Design a protein around this motif. Structure first.
Motif, mmCIF file in Angstrom:
data_model
loop_
_atom_site.group_PDB
_atom_site.id
_atom_site.type_symbol
_atom_site.label_atom_id
_atom_site.label_comp_id
_atom_site.label_asym_id
_atom_site.label_seq_id
_atom_site.Cartn_x
_atom_site.Cartn_y
_atom_site.Cartn_z
ATOM 1 N N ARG A 129 14.689 1.699 8.203
ATOM 2 C CA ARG A 129 15.362 2.896 7.719
ATOM 3 C C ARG A 129 16.659 2.442 7.089
ATOM 4 N N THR A 130 16.972 3.037 5.952
ATOM 5 C CA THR A 130 17.977 2.453 5.093
ATOM 6 C C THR A 130 18.929 3.492 4.483
ATOM 7 N N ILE A 188 0.775 -1.225 0.000
ATOM 8 C CA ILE A 188 0.000 0.000 0.000
ATOM 9 C C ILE A 188 0.821 1.299 0.000
ATOM 10 N N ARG A 189 2.079 1.231 0.444
ATOM 11 C CA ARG A 189 2.968 2.409 0.423
ATOM 12 C C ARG A 189 3.923 2.500 -0.770
ATOM 13 N N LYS A 190 3.880 1.518 -1.670
ATOM 14 C CA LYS A 190 4.787 1.509 -2.821
ATOM 15 C C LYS A 190 4.591 2.751 -3.673
ATOM 16 N N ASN A 191 5.699 3.393 -4.021
ATOM 17 C CA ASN A 191 5.630 4.699 -4.673
ATOM 18 C C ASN A 191 5.398 4.576 -6.181
ATOM 19 N N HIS A 192 5.900 3.476 -6.744
ATOM 20 C CA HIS A 192 5.791 3.167 -8.168
ATOM 21 C C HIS A 192 4.495 2.408 -8.449
ATOM 22 N N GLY A 193 3.395 2.945 -7.946
ATOM 23 C CA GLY A 193 2.145 2.202 -7.913
ATOM 24 C C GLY A 193 1.375 1.989 -9.205
ATOM 25 N N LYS A 194 0.409 1.076 -9.122
ATOM 26 C CA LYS A 194 -0.674 0.977 -10.095
ATOM 27 C C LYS A 194 -1.828 1.942 -9.682
ATOM 28 N N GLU A 195 -1.484 2.946 -8.855
ATOM 29 C CA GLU A 195 -2.279 4.183 -8.584
ATOM 30 C C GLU A 195 -3.456 4.022 -7.600
ATOM 31 N N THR A 197 9.952 0.857 1.182
ATOM 32 C CA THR A 197 9.011 1.819 1.810
ATOM 33 C C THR A 197 9.322 2.011 3.259
ATOM 34 N N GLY A 198 10.028 1.053 3.844
ATOM 35 C CA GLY A 198 10.225 1.021 5.288
ATOM 36 C C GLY A 198 9.097 0.332 6.038
ATOM 37 N N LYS A 211 -6.027 -20.839 -0.057
ATOM 38 C CA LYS A 211 -5.231 -20.868 -1.252
ATOM 39 C C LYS A 211 -3.824 -21.017 -0.733
ATOM 40 N N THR A 212 -3.265 -22.217 -0.867
ATOM 41 C CA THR A 212 -1.903 -22.486 -0.410
ATOM 42 C C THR A 212 -0.842 -21.936 -1.345
ATOM 43 N N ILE A 213 0.222 -21.420 -0.739
ATOM 44 C CA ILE A 213 1.316 -20.840 -1.469
ATOM 45 C C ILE A 213 2.578 -21.235 -0.735
ATOM 46 N N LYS A 214 3.743 -20.897 -1.287
ATOM 47 C CA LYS A 214 5.005 -21.076 -0.578
ATOM 48 C C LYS A 214 5.211 -19.946 0.428
ATOM 49 N N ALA A 215 5.393 -20.295 1.699
ATOM 50 C CA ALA A 215 5.672 -19.281 2.728
ATOM 51 C C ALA A 215 6.636 -18.206 2.232
ATOM 52 N N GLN A 216 7.773 -18.626 1.680
ATOM 53 C CA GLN A 216 8.848 -17.703 1.312
ATOM 54 C C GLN A 216 8.570 -16.746 0.133
ATOM 55 N N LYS A 217 7.544 -17.054 -0.650
ATOM 56 C CA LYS A 217 6.997 -16.105 -1.617
ATOM 57 C C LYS A 217 6.378 -14.854 -0.930
ATOM 58 N N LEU A 218 5.662 -15.048 0.180
ATOM 59 C CA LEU A 218 5.122 -13.926 0.940
ATOM 60 C C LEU A 218 6.272 -13.187 1.598
ATOM 61 N N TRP A 219 7.150 -13.943 2.254
ATOM 62 C CA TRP A 219 8.334 -13.404 2.898
ATOM 63 C C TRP A 219 9.118 -12.475 1.968
ATOM 64 N N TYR A 220 9.538 -12.969 0.802
ATOM 65 C CA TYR A 220 10.252 -12.166 -0.186
ATOM 66 C C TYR A 220 9.578 -10.826 -0.505
ATOM 67 N N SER A 221 8.262 -10.870 -0.688
ATOM 68 C CA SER A 221 7.474 -9.674 -0.940
ATOM 69 C C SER A 221 7.467 -8.697 0.245
ATOM 70 N N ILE A 222 7.303 -9.224 1.476
ATOM 71 C CA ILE A 222 7.400 -8.430 2.717
ATOM 72 C C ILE A 222 8.703 -7.641 2.739
ATOM 73 N N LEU A 223 9.817 -8.358 2.624
ATOM 74 C CA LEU A 223 11.150 -7.746 2.618
ATOM 75 C C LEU A 223 11.345 -6.731 1.486
#
Ligand code: TTP
Ligand code: TTP
Ligand code: GDP
Ligand code: GDP
Ligand code: MG
Ligand code: MG
Lengths: 649, 649
Positions: free
Chosen positions: A647-648, A224-231, A309-310, A291-303
């Motif tokens: 913070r990065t 929801i905070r991604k700056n390069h959004g689909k608007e 965005t922080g 709807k089952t998925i691979k845990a680490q697919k969500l993880w990767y997206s989180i990171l």
């Protein structure tokens, strides 16, 4: 105007000229008090104490804190402080003067909403609200929206949990239509945060939203905070925060599966935790409900979202619930805007907190002979009991924006003490942040603040009765915070006698500790934010760390080749031509401290923290592997707030 | 499936497979009725009547009207019609069959929400809601928002009036902040219209907003649809409509001044009209309460917005109020989404209408000998009384989305009859739209529909009592619509006897007439929209006006040089090589008819219209002077709805 009663008089008699409307800026009882004790109150004030504020701290006070009449400033800092003291204390003049003195000497300060509204007609002195989405219906959504609007009319941030809302495509009974899901409903909320400015002034936006990582709408939510959004897919002015069950961290670590549910096809998941959750979750999973998925697919997206965005913030559901004194109330479904508060909320109960921070430098004293300084743990204990009493007063004297907030607060009476200037305290005492001496000092500070606040609340429970929901609480059984971490306390204070008294007499407050960010209240007092290391040894006007500055001159080595290197190196002094190793070790930037020590220290102080604390993570050269190890490190260290912002650089 | 009871059976027993939820598509009482009269009801149906729909009219029915089971069509047009007949009529089988027959033979049809929901469990058969902004407060704004959301869960459009909301910069008590004004609050509403789709289906958006041209926020408001926006300043999915007092048209005509107020610095303006308004307005003006400007500066901007967007709509406040039978209720503050409805609304009363349209071609009959056709005014009268009774039934059998809508409707019982295929009726009868014969026919049609609907409502008032708020109404005093225009009726029907009966027995309905756009319900029956001339003699698949087509062949002159000229000339036949003047005169496009005749005809039929009607204006080569003269022409002709859309080329 010098005289305080004269200043009060103006404030109280003020009239909006553009409209002919009497617009009093002081309440009736606080007017009457001032007038009934004019001589005492005016001659109590030490205006010399106005010179304790740096140029920048005073300009923070002027810009948004000191009351104004027709845009011109009407309040001297000492007047604001006495106004707060009376607003909090009313008729108890003795305590008012005590608080005026402690505050004006900079031992502590109260959170911004308090500084703004104490002693004024609409006295909304709370900083935090945690709101429950009321029902999975248009009505419940809109009753909830109204409630955020009404709360946004006043100072304070909102944490809102949305675990119960139907995900995309879920069915709507009595129509071939299906749900739009979370994103379109988040957009409504974002728009309400943008509208309710309090008018046309400057602190606007800011709702944090809480979701468990199993909700089917999660991949869009974290983004929801991604700056390069689909608007239309985004919510610029809102903050995603993750309410993470242990099971999720397990599935990610095991490189296993993770299953996404609509709350409607898998009811009850947010209304349990721990093993009961894992059993219900795992059953829903096997029953083919998601709807089952691979845990680490969500993880990767989180990171990936966090890196960019922080956000989202990360708060562990199970740690929060397992180690809360409010666990007899039901399952806590969220934290708040800045991830310090951990309090139960329901459709009819909107959790509130009132915050203050103890200024940690004020207790450093050389008092021995010459040079050598110690830390006055006895004075700290003393002040923390004062701050505790003040915040109970605030509970009773507060004006609540909504009835769910009053019902909640009068019932459980939670309080939140924190700190500012921990970095200042380490720097003054010649302690590196990552030193064993700093590590010890951090534990003992948090031990005494916790003990003090508990003792003072126990005394209040003796005068006034325990809080309504004390019986059945872990406190009523002798289970204090550190006990719930299966630790013995450090032992600077007599915990057996305190525990003995709690069990016997109760405490006044369900909760007492939540070290907060202190973002603006650290600037008034002129200390570093809360409990975090200095970010830069160069403020920016451009100021160099004062304890650094002093040290360089005492060594001679401060020229201009030194001044320019600091602005170059982002206020870092590491690898710098002619600086002793002692200074290097002392004036490490947060980017130069082992994120592991940060988390260790966080985990040590966390046994004396009732609630949680706003734990920013700072990664210099960030990677997915690096970040992963910080999340899992904090998670296993048992943290409630794994992460506030990322913070990065 | 052929058999209707079998079709009902499926509909009723339907279960959502994706969820295991019983999802009945028929109500209990309408199921029981069908089953208790299966033989009668199944053998009543004439499936040959399904072939009365053109290819396009049937495809309109298929796409969004006939009930579906698992995406596949489940209803034959005849089944939908009988379902509507029962939903409306229940146990009164006699009337059900009467309505089935009249509807299936295409004498009239009911508005879309009726066709969608009659005989189904959630029977929301109303098309229109007019909502009052509840209070000038965050709470009132948000109670109102909730209400629009709840109404947007169902079929129907909303008119919302906002005259009472503080303009930009207005003061907010208990804070140095000031109001954001209308635009930021409109943005919230726009966002709620986008969210409540009924799910993920296709008729979404659409609130009309009503404002008097004196509100200080007016210049931004009229521009809310501008495409070349400053972005956040707009409301893409909402429609501005102007609620214009005569004083404004006067000031514009006099080239005088116009004064802009916040409702808070000039209270009560929307809660009066006529001379009382002009006195209050003029007093506020002289007292220095507003911001004076040149009338014609606002005017120019209105026309500029209209030229570009087709909005704002224009409805004259004073005409509406002065000539309404609901004037004993209080001051009417708005029209609705399409500018036909004129009904009183308050914070606790949300005005509702149920609509149907009489298909005007169905009453043309040659019945004499050969060729020569007449118009059966006696059958029209007869049918219009049937449609009247049906719409009262709907009142009682409707499910109301909100309590303000039920309270309003049960109290005043307003009804809205309209027409479609007026252009068809003129075209068939060999009458040019601008002819004296067309002018006469339009008056007599509207006379008989009004008289019929009034007579039938008087009969219902004898069976059931007058509507709650009949006493004190202009009807109770003998003041019927045309009387309020200070005209004698055309005199085809005996008005004295009707008036005599109303005065004695009451009417069942506060209002009865509101010719609506018929945008989709004209396509089902395959006639031209409502009361407006053909826009093009070439539909588009690409179809040529059937009465035109027929005429060309009868003359021989239809080749391909004719087919291509029609697609070239936008379905205009003016200045076309070999076409008689009789055809030219007959098949004028709306762009080719004097906008003055349109307004004359509008003004003639308007004396038999209780409420108002959705009066589009069509300007070929548009200018500010041209548009100005159409607005003032209609205004002086005494029109309620001066203008619905401005459609342009
Ligand atoms: C009506 C509507 C609901 N929703 C969402 C909001 C709610 O989370 C959810 C259902 O809310 P509601 O439909 O308002 O509640 P309901 O009484 O209809 O409950 P149900 O139909 O299941 O018995 O659907 C949309 O996303 N878009 C819509 O247009
Ligand atoms: C609080 C707030 C109100 N408003 C508008 C909405 C309302 O139309 C108007 C006042 O609403 P409210 O302030 O909510 O109503 P109130 O009780 O404060 O009334 P008052 O202060 O005058 O006694 O201000 C904003 O535009 N932005 C805001 O942040
Ligand atoms: N509405 C709003 N609330 C905030 C903001 N920052 C902090 N808060 C609230 O105040 C609490 C801690 O604030 P903090 O950063 O220490 O600043 P302080 O309150 O000004 O001293 C949080 O728990 C929030 O709920 C903000 O930017 N907007
Ligand atoms: N929500 C919504 N309502 C509409 C729309 N068009 C028409 N209506 C409502 O229905 C009434 C007249 O509709 P009309 O155009 O004749 O179409 P019909 O109802 O489908 O036959 C208006 O007064 C509106 O309130 C639309 O696009 N959206
Ligand atoms: Mg519901
Ligand atoms: Mg108000």
């Amino acid at each position: 105007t010098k005289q305080f009663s004269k200043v009060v008089e103006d404030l109280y008699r003020y009239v909006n000229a553009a409209t002919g409307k009497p617009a009093p800026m002081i309440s009736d009882d606080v007017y009457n008090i001032v007038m009934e004790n004019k001589d005492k109150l005016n001659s109590a004030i030490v205006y010399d104490r106005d010179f304790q504020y740096s140029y920048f701290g005073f300009k923070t006070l002027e810009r948004s804190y000191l009351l104004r009449i027709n845009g011109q400033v009407a309040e001297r800092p000492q007047h604001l402080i006495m106004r707060v003291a009376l607003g909090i204390h009313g008729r108890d003049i003795e305590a008012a003067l005590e608080t005026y003195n402690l505050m004006s000497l900079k031992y502590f300060t109260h959170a911004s909403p308090t500084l703004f509204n104490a002693g004024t007609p609409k006295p909304q002195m709370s900083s935090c609200f945690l709101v429950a989405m009321k029902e999975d219906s248009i009505e419940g959504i809109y009753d909830t929206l109204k409630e955020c609007a009404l709360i946004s009319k006043t100072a304070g941030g909102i944490g809102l949990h949305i675990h119960n809302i139907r995900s995309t495509g879920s069915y709507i009974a009595g129509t071939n239509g299906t749900s739009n899901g979370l994103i379109p409903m988040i957009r409504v909320f974002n728009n309400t945060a943008r509208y309710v400015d309090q008018g046309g002034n400057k602190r606007p936006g800011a709702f944090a939203l809480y979701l468990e990582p199993w909700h089917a709408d999660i991949f869009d939510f974290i983004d929801i905070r991604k700056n390069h959004g689909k608007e239309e897919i985004r919510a610029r002015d809102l903050f995603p925060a993750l309410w993470i069950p242990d099971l999720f961290m397990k599935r990610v670590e095991e490189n296993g599966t993770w299953t996404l549910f609509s709350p409607t096809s898998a009811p009850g998941l947010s209304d349990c935790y721990g093993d009961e959750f894992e059993a219900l979750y795992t059953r829903y999973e096997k029953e083919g409900r998601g709807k089952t998925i691979k845990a680490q697919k969500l993880w990767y997206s989180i990171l990936e979202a966090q890196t960019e965005t922080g956000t989202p913030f990360v708060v562990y559901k199970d740690a929060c619930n397992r180690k809360s004194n409010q666990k007899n109330l039901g399952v806590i479904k969220s934290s708040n805007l800045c991830c310090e508060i951990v309090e139960y909320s329901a459709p009819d109960e909107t959790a509130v907190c009132n915050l203050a921070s103890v200024a940690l430098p004020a207790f450093i004293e050389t008092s021995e002979d010459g040079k050598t300084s110690t830390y006055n743990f006895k004075k700290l204990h003393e002040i923390a009991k004062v701050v505790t009493r003040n915040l109970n007063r605030v509970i009773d004297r507060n004006y609540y924006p909504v009835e769910e907030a009053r019902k909640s607060n009068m019932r459980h009476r939670p309080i939140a003490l924190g700190v500012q200037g921990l970095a200042d305290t380490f720097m003054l005492l010649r302690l590196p942040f990552d030193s064993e001496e700093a590590r010890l000092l951090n534990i003992q500070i948090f031990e005494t603040i916790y003990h003090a606040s508990m003792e003072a609340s126990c005394e209040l429970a003796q005068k006034d009765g325990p809080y309504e929901t004390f019986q059945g609480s872990p406190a009523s059984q002798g289970i204090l915070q550190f006990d719930m971490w299966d630790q013995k306390p450090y032992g600077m204070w007599d915990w057996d006698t305190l525990r003995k008294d709690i069990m016997k007499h109760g405490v006044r407050n369900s909760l007492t500790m939540a070290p907060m960010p202190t973002a603006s209240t650290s600037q008034i007092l002129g200390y570093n934010e809360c409990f975090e290391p200095v970010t830069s040894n160069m403020y920016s006007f451009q100021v160099v760390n004062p304890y650094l500055l002093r040290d360089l001159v005492d060594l001679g080595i401060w020229d201009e080749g030194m001044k320019q290197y600091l602005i170059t190196q982002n206020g870092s002094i590491q690898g710098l031509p002619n600086v002793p190793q002692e200074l290097k070790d002392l004036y490490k930037t947060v980017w130069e401290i082992s994120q592991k020590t940060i988390i260790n220290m966080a985990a040590d102080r966390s046994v004396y923290i009732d609630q949680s604390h706003s734990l920013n993570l700072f990664l210099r050269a960030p990677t997915m592997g690096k970040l992963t190890s910080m999340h899992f490190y904090g998670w296993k260290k048992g943290l409630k707030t794994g992460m506030y912002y990322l913070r990065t650089q």
